[PDB]
Structure formats: C-alpha cells, structure tokens
Amino acid sequence: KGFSYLVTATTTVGVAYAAKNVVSQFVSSMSASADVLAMSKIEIKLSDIPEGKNMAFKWRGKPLFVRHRTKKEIDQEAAVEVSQLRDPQHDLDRVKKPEWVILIGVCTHLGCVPIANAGDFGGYYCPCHGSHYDASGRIRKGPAPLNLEVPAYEFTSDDVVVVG
Amino acid sequence: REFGNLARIRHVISYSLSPFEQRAFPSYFSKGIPNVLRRTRERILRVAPPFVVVYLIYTWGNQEFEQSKRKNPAMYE
Amino acid sequence: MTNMRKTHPLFKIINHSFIDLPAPSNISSWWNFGSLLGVCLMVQIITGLFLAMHYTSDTMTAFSSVTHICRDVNYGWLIRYMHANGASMFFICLFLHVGRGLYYGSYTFMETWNIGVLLLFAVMATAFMGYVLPWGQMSFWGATVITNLLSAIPYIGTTLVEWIWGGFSVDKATLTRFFAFHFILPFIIAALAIVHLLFLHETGSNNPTGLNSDADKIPFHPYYTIKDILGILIMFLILMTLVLFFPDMLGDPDNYMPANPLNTPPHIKPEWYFLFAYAILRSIPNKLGGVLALILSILILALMPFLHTSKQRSLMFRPITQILYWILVANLLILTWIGGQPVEHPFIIIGQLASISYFSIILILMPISGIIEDKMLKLY
Amino acid sequence: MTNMRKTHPLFKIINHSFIDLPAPSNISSWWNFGSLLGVCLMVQIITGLFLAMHYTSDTMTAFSSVTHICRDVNYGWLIRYMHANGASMFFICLFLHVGRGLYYGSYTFMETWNIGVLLLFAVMATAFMGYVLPWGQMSFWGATVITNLLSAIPYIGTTLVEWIWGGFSVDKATLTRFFAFHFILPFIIAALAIVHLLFLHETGSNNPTGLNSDADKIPFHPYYTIKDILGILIMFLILMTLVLFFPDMLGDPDNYMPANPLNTPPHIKPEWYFLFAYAILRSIPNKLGGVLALILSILILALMPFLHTSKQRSLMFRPITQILYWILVANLLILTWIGGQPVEHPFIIIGQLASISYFSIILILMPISGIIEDKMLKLY
Amino acid sequence: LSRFLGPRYRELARNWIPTAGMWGTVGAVGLVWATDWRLILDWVPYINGKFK
Amino acid sequence: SDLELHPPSYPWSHRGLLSSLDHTSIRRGFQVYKQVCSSCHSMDYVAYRHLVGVCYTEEEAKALAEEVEVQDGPNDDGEMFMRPGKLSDYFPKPYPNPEAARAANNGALPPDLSYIVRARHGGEDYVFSLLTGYCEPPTGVSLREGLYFNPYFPGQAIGMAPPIYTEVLEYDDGTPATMSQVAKDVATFLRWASEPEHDHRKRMGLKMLLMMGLLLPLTYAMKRHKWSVLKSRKLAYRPP
Amino acid sequence: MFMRPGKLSDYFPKPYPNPEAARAANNGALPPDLSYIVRARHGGEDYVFSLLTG
Amino acid sequence: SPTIPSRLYSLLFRRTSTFALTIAVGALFFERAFDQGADAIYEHINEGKLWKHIKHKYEN
Ligand SMILES: CCCCCCCCCCCCCCCCCC(=O)OC[C@H](COP(=O)(O)OCCN)OC(=O)CCCCCCCCCCCCCCCCC
Ligand code: HEC
Ligand code: HEM
Ligand code: HEM
Ligand code: HEM
Ligand code: HEM
Ligand code: FES
Fold first, then answer.
1. Per its UniProt record, what Pfam families does this chain match (chain H)?
2. Which of C186, D336, F36, F121 is the residue whose CA sits 20 to 30 A from C157?
3. Is residue D11 less than 8 Å (CB to CB) from chain C?
4. Contact between chains at B57 and C350 (C-beta distance less than 8 A)
5. Which residues, other chains included, contact C273 with Cβ-Cβ below 8 Å and sequence gap of 6+?
6. Do H and E count as touching (3 or more CB pairs closer than 8 A)?
7. Is C354:C290 a contact under the CB 8 Å cutoff?
8. What is the extent of the structural domain holding D218?
9. In total, how many domains does chain C have?
10. What's the Cα-to-Cα distance from D260 to each of C280, D140, D206, F134, rounded to whole Å?
11. Within an 8 Å CB–CB cutoff, is residue F236 touching chain D?
C-alpha cells in the first residue's frame, strides 16, 4: 500500500506542479504587458511648464500634475504647520525641488483626480466628493483619508527630469 | 411531486363552467372597483406613511441644500 | 402508441418542468417577475449580440463605434437603447424579484436563495462592465472609481488592481478585457439560472399566503403561460415606451462625450441601480470599512434565512413586519436619492442615518418584530 | 443520516450521469474521444476567452492586436498557438469520434447521432470564423471563397451573401460580426453537447462488440475516470508538443501576412478538414452542384443510420465492411491530400475518382456489403 | 443553538482538532506554494535560493 | 516559369529540437539589418524593448535607440517635432505609406520583415537561399530594368539587386563579414524577429518532455492499478 | 497627400487637426464637438438656447 | 526492519491530511529541483549561445 500510494503521490505532485504553472502563466497573461511596462518610464518633461501653471501627463498610468510652485505658495506651505494636519507632512519633505512640484492626481477616497487650479486652499480640488488640497498636496477640507502621493523623481540638469 | 400525489384531499367538491360558456369580464367595474377600494383600505396604512416621510425628508434635504448654497450675509461691518 | 410529450426525453423534461409543472393556483403578479427576468436576459443576449456584432472594443474606436452603431447602422440606435433600457428593466425586475423573496418568505429555499444571490453579484458585475464599454467620460471615471474602491483592500488591493487593470490605469487592455468579460458572463448567468430553476423545481414554488399549496395546485400551462405572456407584454410596454419616448431619462448625459483622463467630471455618480451601495459606502467614512459595508450589504441577502425567527412564513399576516419592510423599502429609496446627491450638508448625515437604519432594520428590528408577533399571537 | 450523493439534486444528477453511470466494461481507447472533445472545448473556451481579452476586432488593428498578443502579452504566444493547435486537435478528435461511431454502429442512436451532426456543423462554422479572425491574407481570401460558395445558391445567394458580408465584400462589418459569432457559438456548442450527452444517457453507451452490455457493466468511477485522465494526458502531450515544437506544422505561412484585397496568394489552401471540403467541392465543375456536393458530403453522416441493412451492429465481426470502411478512410485521406494539392492533372481526375468512390461506398457499396455478409452468414 | 454545547460534542470536537489543524496547515502550505510568498519562502533553507 | 526551386535544409544551430538561437549571431544580423536592410524594409513589430535581454544590453539598446530620430506630438502649439527615440519606440519605417515604397522601389513593395520567416515557405532557409542565390539569368530569358534573376523567388524575377556582398559592413566583434556569413547572421536575426519566443518555447518544451515522460508511466501505473481488479477477474458459469 | 472637393461620404471638416492646436489657437479653451452636445449637456436644446441668448 | 515505502505509509500516507501535506511539501521541493535540473540541462545543451552566457562580454 505504501508503494501504490507513493506512485499516486508522485503523480499528484506532478499534476499539481503542472496546474500551478498553467494557472500562473494565465494569471501572468492577465497582468500588464511588455509595452505597458515600457511606457511606465517617463521621458523628459522639458521646461514647457509656465510660471504658476500645472501640466497634466501620464505617469505610472495615472494623471500626474507637475506644477510650478510660486514663491508665495511655497511660503504659505512653509507657514502651514506639519502637525496641524491629519498626517505628518512638510513642504520640504514632500518636494525636493521647490521650483517645480510633481504629484499624482490620485485621491484617497475613491481614487479620483483633482481639478487643476481650483479649491479653497489655492492648490487642487477633487470634484468627485469636493476635497481641497493646498500647494503641498496635504488635504485641508474634504473626505480624503490620506494626503496626495508624490511620485519618485530624479532630476538631471535643469532641462531633464525623470519620473516613475 | 407530480400530479399523481401531492396531498390527501377528501370530501371536497369543485364546480366550474366552460370559458366558452361564462363571461370573461363579469361585472368588471361594478364589482371590481369596490374590491380595489377594499384592498387599498386593508393595506393603505402600513404602506403609505414610509413614502410620506420619504417625501418629507426629501423636500427637507432639497431645501436645506438650497439654503446651504444660498449665501449668508455675515459680512456687514 | 405512446404519449410523446411524456415519453420523449427532452420533451418529457420540458413537460415536467414547464408544461405539467404543479404550480400554486393563487400566486399573484409578483410571481411573473422570474419569467420577466428570464425574458429580459434573452433580450439582453440577442440585443447585445447585435451590439457586439457592430461594436469595436478599442479606446481609439469605442466611442466612434458607438456613434457608428447609433447613426450609420440601420436602427442600431434602437438596438443600443433597447439594450440600455433592458438592462435598467432587468434591475427593476431583479429588485421586485428580491422584494417578493423578502416579503413572501421565499428565502427559506436556502439553496435557491444563495444561487440567486450569486446571480445578483454576476448581473451587477456584467452591468458595471457593460457601462464601462461605451468609453464615455463618466464611464471611464466610474470604472476608475469602482476599481479604486476595490483597491481599498490592504496588501492585496494594489497588486490585484494592477492585475485587473491589465496595466497601470484604465486603458485599452482594461476596456478590451471588460468587453470580453461582459460578453461572456451572461452565459454563466444563464447556466446559473438553469441551476436556480433546478433548485426551485426540487423545492417547489411558494404562494403569497405562505402555506402548503398542495391542496390547490394547477398546471403551469395554460394559466401561467398566458399570465407570463401578459407580463411580457406589459414589460415590453414599459421597455418600449422608455426606448421610444424617453431614451435618456434613466441614462447619463456625460456618457455622450469621449473619455478624457485629464478632465474630471464635476459630479460623478454610477448608474441608478448602484446608488444605494454607493450611498452607504459614502456614508461609512473608511476605505476598507466602506467596501466591507458594500459587500456585507449585498451578503445580508444570503444571511436572510438565518434571521427568520417567526413561525409564520410569509408577511401576509404579520403587520408589524410589513411596516418594517415598507420602512426598509423607503430606506432603499432614500439611499438611492442620497447616492444620486453629492457630498454636501446634510446629505452626509442623511446617508449615515439611512445606512444605519437599513442595517438595523434588516439585522435587529425584523427578528425582534417576528418574536413580538409570535408572542402577540400566543405561540408560546 | 442519508447519502448526499443521491439526496442533493445537483449531486444526484452528477451521480446518475458521471459517477454511478453504468458503462460497458470493454470499451477501448476510441471511447475516450468524447471526453477529449469536451476537454478541448473547455480549453478553447478559456484560451479564446483570454485571446478576446487581449484581442480587438477591427481590420486595421486585428493583425496588430494578434502580433501584440504574440509579442507584448506574457505567454500570449503560448495562448494563441494553444488555440490554433487545439483547434487542429479538436478536429482530429472529432474525426476519430465520427469514425468510432461509423465503425461500431453508434449511429443507430438516431437522436444522439443527429445532435452530433449539428455539433459538427457548429464546430466547423466556429472554426472557419476563428480562422478568419486574425485577418490574414489566406483568412480574408478563404472567407471570400466560402461566401462566394454561399452565393452560388440561385435567386437567394447574391442578396444572402451581401447580407452576410454586411456590404459587398469581406470588410470591417464582416470581421466584427464574425468575431461576435465566433465568440458566442461554442456556448451553443456546449449547450447542444449537453443535449448530446442527455440523448446518449437516455440509452447508455455502446460496446465495441455491438452486443447487449447489460450483462457486464462497471461504474464510470474510478475506472473510466482514470482512463479518461490518461487520455487527457496523452492528448495534452500531443497538443503541447505540437505547440512547443511544431507550431506551424498544421498552420499556414500566408496567414502571417496582412490581408490585401488587391494581392492574392497563388494557392487557396485552408486547414486540413476544409481541404477535404474544398476537394469535394472542386470535384464536379459547377457552382450549385459543388455546393450540393459539399452539403451532402456533410449530411451523409445524418443519412448514415438509414443505410444500415445488416443484422449485426458493429464491424468487429464483419470483415468485408471492414475493408470497405478502411477504403473509406483511405479516400478521406486521398481527398484531403487533393485538397492540399493545386489544380492540375492528375489531381483533377484523382479528385473526382475519389469523390465518386467515397459517395458510392457510403450509399451503395456498404449496404450491399452488409447483405453479402448476411447471406454468407445465413442471415439473408 | 445549544446543539453543539455538550460533553459528546466537546470530545468529538477535540478529537477533530488535530485533523482540522493539519488540514489548515495543508491549506496554508498549498496557498503559499501557489502564490510564492516572499515573507514565508525567504526563510526556508532551500526555496529562498532561487529568489536571490 | 511556374516551376520553383525548393530551398535546401541548412543545418542551423537552432534547427535542433531542443537547440536555441545563437544570440551573438542575432546581434550580428541585427546590425546587418540596421546598416543594410533598414533603408528599404520596414519593421513594424520589433522594438528596442524586445532588443534588450536578447542580443544587446539595456544601456547599449537605449543608446542605439537615441542614435535615430522619431517623430512625436502633438506640440504645445499643436504640431509634430523630432525627438530622440527610446526603448519604447518601434523600429523606424523607411517610408510613410506603401505608395512611397513602390515609388522609391519602381513599383515593387518591400514587405515588412517582422513575419517574413513565418510567412515564406522554407523560412530562414528560403531567406538564405534568396540572399545567396543571385546569378546571371540563363540564355533564353531577358529581364527588363529593375528586375534581377533569382531562382529561389517564385517567378524567378525579383525587384532587388543583390543587397549583400563581401565586406558589406563592419562587424563590431571582428568576425570576417563574408556574404555567406552576413546572410546567415541576418537569417538568424530574421528568425528571431519572426519568433522571439523561440528559446523560452524550447526550454518549456524540454520541461514538458521531461515532466510528461515522468507522468505518463505513473498515470498508466495508476490506470492499470485501478483497472487490475477487472483485468484479473475470472468468470465461472455453474448451471444446475 | 492632396486636396479634393468633398463628396457625400465625407464628414464635416474639422477646423483644427488636433485639440492642442484648437486650444492654442482659441486661447486655451477647447471647443467641444457639437455632435452629442445636446444629449451631453443637462437641459439640452434649452441649455443651448439659454447659453447663446444669455 | 520496516522498508522505505513501509515507513512512508506508516508515517505519512495512512492519514489523508498528512498525505496532502507531504504532497504539498513534495510539490515545493520537486518544483525547485526540477526547475534546477531542467535549466541545467537547457544551458548545457545550449552552452555558449544564450544571453546569460554571452552577457559578461558586454555587461562590464
Ligand atoms: C482472399 C484473401 C485470403 C487470405 C487468406 C490468408 C490465410 C487465412 C488462414 C490463416 C489465418 C491468417 C490470418 C487471418 C487474418 C484475418 C483474416 C483475413 O485476413 O481474411 C482475409 C481478408 C478478409 O476476407 P474477406 O473480407 O472475407 O474477403 C472477401 C473478398 N473481398 O481479406 C483480405 O485481406 C483482402 C483485402 C484486399 C483489399 C484490397 C483493396 C484494394 C483497393 C483499395 C482502394 C483504397 C482507396 C484508394 C483511392 C480510391 C479513389 C481514387
Ligand atoms: C531596397 C533596395 C531593399 C533592400 C536594401 C532590401 N530589400 Fe528585400 N525587397 C525590396 C523590394 C523592392 C522587394 C519586392 C521585390 C519583388 O519582386 O516583389 C523585396 C522583397 C524581399 C523579400 C520577399 C520575397 C518574397 O518571396 O516575398 C525578402 C524575403 C527580402 N526582400 C529580403 C531582404 C533582406 C533579408 C534584406 C536585408 C539584407 C533586404 N531584402 C534588403 C527592397 C529591398
Ligand atoms: C439574475 C437572474 C435571475 C433569474 C433569471 C431568476 C429566475 C427565476 C425564475 C424563473 C423563478 C420562478 C418564478 C416564480 O417562481 O415566481 C424564480 C424564483 C425565485 N427566485 Fe429567482 N432569478 C434570478 C435572480 C434571483 C435573485 C437575485 C434572487 C434573490 C436574492 C432569486 C431568488 C428566487 C427565489 C427565492 C425564488 C422562489 C420564488 C417562490 O418560490 O415563490 N432569484 N427565479
Ligand atoms: C451576452 C450578453 C450581452 C452582450 C453581448 C452585451 C453587449 C454589450 C455591448 C457590446 C455594449 C456596448 C455597446 C454600447 O453600449 O453602445 C453593452 C453595453 C451595456 N450593457 Fe451589455 N451585453 C450583454 C448583456 C448585458 C446584461 C445582462 C446587462 C445588464 C443586466 C448589460 C448591461 C449593459 C449596459 C448598462 C450597457 C451600457 C449601454 C450604454 O451605456 O449605452 N448587458 N453591452
Ligand atoms: C464537440 C463535439 C462533441 C462532443 C463534446 C461530444 C460528446 C460526446 C461524449 C462525451 C460522448 C461519450 C464518450 C463515448 O461514448 O465514447 C459521446 C458519444 C457519442 N457521440 Fe459525441 N460528441 C461530439 C460530437 C459528435 C459527433 C460529430 C458525432 C457523430 C457524427 C457524435 C456522435 C456520438 C455518438 C453516436 C456517441 C455514442 C457512442 C457510444 O454509445 O459508444 N458526437 N459524445
Ligand atoms: C468560446 C470559445 C472560443 C473563443 C472565445 C474563441 C476566440 C478566438 C479568438 C479571439 C481568436 C482570434 C485570436 C487569434 O487568432 O490570435 C480565435 C482564433 C481561432 N479560433 Fe477560436 N475561439 C473559441 C472556440 C474555438 C473553437 C471551439 C474552435 C475550433 C473547433 C476555434 C477555432 C479557431 C481557430 C482555428 C482560430 C485561428 C487561430 C490562428 O489563426 O492561429 N475557436 N478564437
Ligand atoms: S475621491 Fe477625492 S474627495 Fe472623494
């Protein structure tokens, strides 16, 4: 009985390995493709962004706003306290380069994008449920459970910036 | 489970006519409108007041939203 | 010679299921909605088959293909509006179906009720994906919203959303895979409706009185044949007047524009049959809490047979539970209206009160009402 | 305590049809082919579902989408080559199924055989539409050829084929409607295969001896379960070694080019079984005559159960009809090879000799062989 | 309600604890084999090597 | 002439049942295509993201992408502009439309060389025979201008002059670039471009062969074990 | 490319080739396509009439 | 002295839960061992041609 059940066990092990490989292959076919992975790298955003304006592009699939942060807006974000919000967030920690700040328009309630140049905080306004965000990306008044995420970026010489 | 056996019925007599021998709308209005009024009387009080308070709080929510969008003159100085 | 109707195998199956089926004699017009649901399912099959016959599932050509169907194709506009209003009437029939099931104690058929619950899940998924299909602005944005509500799950949500997107956001892969799933899943719905009817035929059918109908049972043909035919004709009256006179009053104007990822809609909302779930998930101010509230608010239907604490089956002789049931129906109407309305005062507090009262009635108040009912009738 | 395997309704149906099903003990490996066909049908359902999740049906993007499946989608080359070589394996198993029925007299099950003929119709139509789906040169030209064959019908064919084309030639409307029909038709195949299994289940299976197998029956479990598992593994071996070592052995090279309405290939060579159909078409030199020749060459299986004039069911004990049957398989192979070959001498004359031999064997020579066999065995 | 609160049901339950627990371990090891968790498979002395 | 010349079966390194492609030859044939074959033939389905990890490394393929220019848009003012290409870009087409291809190639359309091996009978053998079979026409046939004799092309008259010869390009690894070597390299590269899943497919085939050679005896063992009780059953008839 | 007189099968000609050119040549705001704008704006023809006369 | 399959039956195969447990554990270990074996056979039968063989000539 041990010999017969050993034969059965090895057969079941082989069939289980084959089934796992088949289902894993089909699930990998479900997932993102090579072109989608290739388009996740961001090219040069150049310097076509105007002063105080925000440009919307496709970063990591999602809409991303790269906005030229004014000196007055940066001063207002610095004057706004980090401990006065729901989560600990500072302007210098959020943005490495204060001249241009790049964020992703993905809200933390329904995954919406905010309306550019709107709201009661001088930053962005999510219109799905009406949340105001300041220039630092922190939520001030709205149903957003978390702050706006900032995508990881590497900056070369001043005409070259890469995101994602 | 079939018509051969489902229940045990004894001493029960059923009479029926032909559809070609009896009418299709026998006193449809005269004996039908009081039936509808009877059914409405039976089930009017345990059905309507939920929808009545739906209408009440719907109107309240609409006018309160309109009042919230309406500005408040708190600016005189 | 033999009786072919009961000796031929397919014919005797048909005869035992639909011709010589012993049905209760006293079942009202609420019992027609199962046949109406099946006929609406077949209508959706044929009509969407013609839509996919003339439809292209690509983000560059989805909206242009819909315009081509509505304008260039001969009466493909009539086909599209029949499809949309048939989906809406499908949810109308589903809501009245589950209303009959809740009111008349039909959930005691636990297998049939659970099969119906998973059928409701499948129909909701198909309709959501088919609303993703025309690639309108509100279509794409509702797809993003509902998928991020799926992303609310910790440690599994982000990877599973990247898996179901086919990429990094809602794109061509998402649209094409939603097209395939929306085409195919109504056939799984049809197979599960076959299982639904099989379980129902095993357990018999219920009557409005909630009693044993075996004393007075009549064949399905010709009685319920002509009753269901009249129901189908009234259903076609409502569906065709919605198609040919008011094609857009149950629709969405923002779906008639191409999907712009840069431009967000000013007021987003799903379709009218998702509004109560959307309102309750708005009401609970938590991501995981909200999505769990949605899932359990559809799963309380499966939880219904374990909440029956009454010695009477149907609500025909239980007036207090009828009052609670109509308050519940009123509460779903309030939830639909609040899900339609935006997030402003006092819609937040109305939505929270509506969701709290809805769960309290369906889980707490109704069994206590049944126990009070039994005590008032002096059953113990 | 009761047995759920006969008490639960879905479980009692599964028990009565697949678990405690009384089956003849002596059936050979030729009886695994029905299960192989069902398994291959499910494999094609899942595989083409994934293909439609990654595939768009539009003329300027169909070939690009197929290439995107092959290159950018992970394991999409494996999925598409599995689909194509599994269609080849499906038709191999279908032909061996039909040959099993013809050799062992299973066509005496009239309803089961007729439903099988309907299944063959649906499978051939589905596979033709799938072959035209990738929008290759040979795909488009074979579609035009088959639709012109449909246009050979007098007084209806021209309007009927402008109707099927959705215009005046094979174009975007034809490709989209063929995508819809190809996606949807295997579900009708699955439902009609359920009807096929029901009609078989009404009378039980057939043994290779052709005798009454009720004296010696075994349950379907676990004997035919493990035998069917072994057959599934062998069929997976052949299919997967085809996909992973010879993915174009049964394919066509001209299908790997974009479809050109102007340029035409020097040869129109569809897949093997359509090569058979093309040769039985090309046999006689008239349009309507060739169309009727193809139609009768497929309906001749439905005409087969009326041609059984022998007193013995199977060909196990009939040696002359064994020779006639293997000559029939021989000129099946010959006609397939002629369909592969171009139109010159001696391919023409071999074509009509093979066609006349095939038709004369099925109509005339087989019942005469049965009569001669009976009169040798003192049965006539 | 009170059907599963008694000595017979308690000793049936504690007889079935080792079998149900072993089945739970089977489900856990099969699920981590199917899904390839880093958090578990990086600690076994062999399977962690192929992740690198 | 309707008669055609069947290409011979060359013994490729990837001809074997479990033998993959030579990626050094794939690389060499790639710069053969780039410096010779890219000026006429398009490549609509092979990209630098497919080039990485097969024949070039990521940085080399990236720089090789930026050495060519790619049109992109729309601009801020709403026009097109030329930018350096990247790994996500496909290979640049030489002509915008096939009409321009026929205009530049006197009425002949050069096909896309991304499925030419899977599209032509014989495959890489046909490509090698076509590229190495250029010869003067026999006495009896005269070919007009723009047409060249080739016994392997059907119809025997091709719209190509011989594209390759001795030292037609300079290999980076110092391999002598003879005509046969160049043709073999570009045929291997075209086989890779037609079927990029070749090595993974053959590795999976080896895995499948080993696993099913392990499983079929075992599954037959269980089948014969469960079927043993029937196959050793003995029958007896004992009438009164 | 070339120019030709329009046939019946031609659609209405777009005044701008891409929406970016429309925004640049019409001071940022993009004029939407008036093919589904009555069906896409709440009010419909009432909204169009009120917007034009208001 | 119990034999090897005797000890396997006495320890693992008699209980169905332990049978499934050793099936899953053997599935893990056989999965990795067969992966190593098949890969080693593949690069030995195709040594000097793959990108992992010619990779070091251009990586550094
Ligand atoms: C008459 C032969 C006598 C042989 C005696 C041998 C010794 C017998 C005693 C010892 C036992 C040895 C082993 C016995 C094995 C089984 C018995 C056997 O083989 O019998 C002979 C066999 C069947 O005999 P039976 O059918 O009765 O013959 C009647 C005449 N037709 O018949 C045969 O094998 C003959 C088969 C001939 C088939 C020729 C077919 C030619 C045409 C094929 C065309 C195919 C299609 C081509 C394309 C057409 C269109 C272009
Ligand atoms: C411009 C002079 C070209 C060069 C450089 C290359 N090719 Fe070509 N190719 C060109 C034309 C104008 C044509 C069509 C000629 C005709 O008579 O149809 C072709 C065709 C081919 C084909 C297809 C042959 C077939 O049977 O379909 C192949 C396989 C081919 N060419 C190969 C090829 C290769 C590998 C090249 C790079 C070394 C190459 N050609 C360069 C134009 C030009
Ligand atoms: C989605 C497609 C569905 C179809 C096609 C369908 C079909 C049917 C049909 C034909 C009937 C018989 C009509 C009758 O007996 O009055 C029926 C009855 C029933 N359905 Fe459904 N149904 C669906 C969904 C549901 C849902 C969502 C539920 C509950 C959550 C459900 C639960 C029931 C119950 C309990 C009955 C029994 C009614 C009685 O016994 O009186 N079904 N269904
Ligand atoms: C096999 C069955 C079905 C098919 C083939 C199908 C097909 C389609 C197609 C092709 C579209 C996009 C065309 C367009 O919207 O213009 C669509 C849209 C849609 N589908 Fe389906 N459908 C099927 C069943 C269903 C069912 C059962 C439902 C709901 C219960 C449903 C709900 C919808 C909805 C709401 C839309 C949106 C229509 C619009 O917004 O204009 N579909 N369907
Ligand atoms: C998609 C295609 C098909 C499927 C899935 C299918 C399914 C099946 C299955 C599972 C069996 C039982 C296995 C067996 O008895 O050997 C069977 C038997 C049978 N099939 Fe099919 N079938 C198909 C096509 C056909 C065709 C094309 C024909 C005839 C022209 C046919 C006629 C029969 C007959 C007569 C039997 C009874 C055999 C016997 O009693 O031994 N079927 N079929
Ligand atoms: C529900 C089941 C099926 C679905 C969803 C489906 C779907 C598809 C799709 C989308 C394609 C085009 C993709 C491509 O060619 O790369 C295709 C191709 C094809 N299909 Fe299907 N199919 C199904 C069943 C079948 C069946 C049952 C057969 C044959 C009996 C079949 C025969 C083919 C063939 C021959 C091709 C051409 C493959 C090639 O050209 O390489 N399909 N199928
Ligand atoms: S999704 Fe942004 S406020 Fe709700």
1. UCR_UQCRX_QCR9
2. C186
3. no
4. yes
5. C88, C91, C95, C124, C127
6. yes
7. no
8. 2-380
9. 1
10. 56, 8, 50, 28
11. no
